Chain A
Amino acid sequence: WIARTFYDGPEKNYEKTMAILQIEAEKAELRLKELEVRRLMRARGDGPWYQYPTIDKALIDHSPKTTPDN
């Protein structure tokens, strides 16, 4: 009676643990990958992250400058 009215079968907890473990393992591997990706992007700078500004080239004036040699 107690088992019927207060508790559930082993399958529920078993498969819930399976799902929880799967989620947590994915989160762990995601964290490790994210750290490695950050290291690579900060080292090389070829990614979208850690992009530091440079001078905009639309500011350059391309016109004769009173002197042939610029």
Chain B
Amino acid sequence: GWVRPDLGELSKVTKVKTDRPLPENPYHSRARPEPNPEAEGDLKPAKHGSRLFFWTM
């Protein structure tokens, strides 16, 4: 009683009912390094200007 699969059926993406657990770390990665501080604030004018040599602004 076997019916031959039609064109376009064996190439389908199907779902699998499995009871095997999903690997939590399949890549065996290390812990990612901590990011840079990402400072935030509200801008204020540069103190006493550019402070480059004799320039007062």
Q: Which residues on A are within 8 Å of B, measured CB to CB? A: 23, 26-27, 30-31, 46-48, 51
Contacts and interface: CB of A to CB of B under 8 A. Distances in A.
Contacts, number: 16
Interface in B26-57: 36-37, 39, 47-48, 51
Interface of B is mostly: loop
A27 B37 contact: no
Interface residues of B, number: 6
Interface of B: 36-37, 39, 47-48, 51
A51 B39 CA distance: 14
A30 B39 contact: no
A30 B37 contact: no
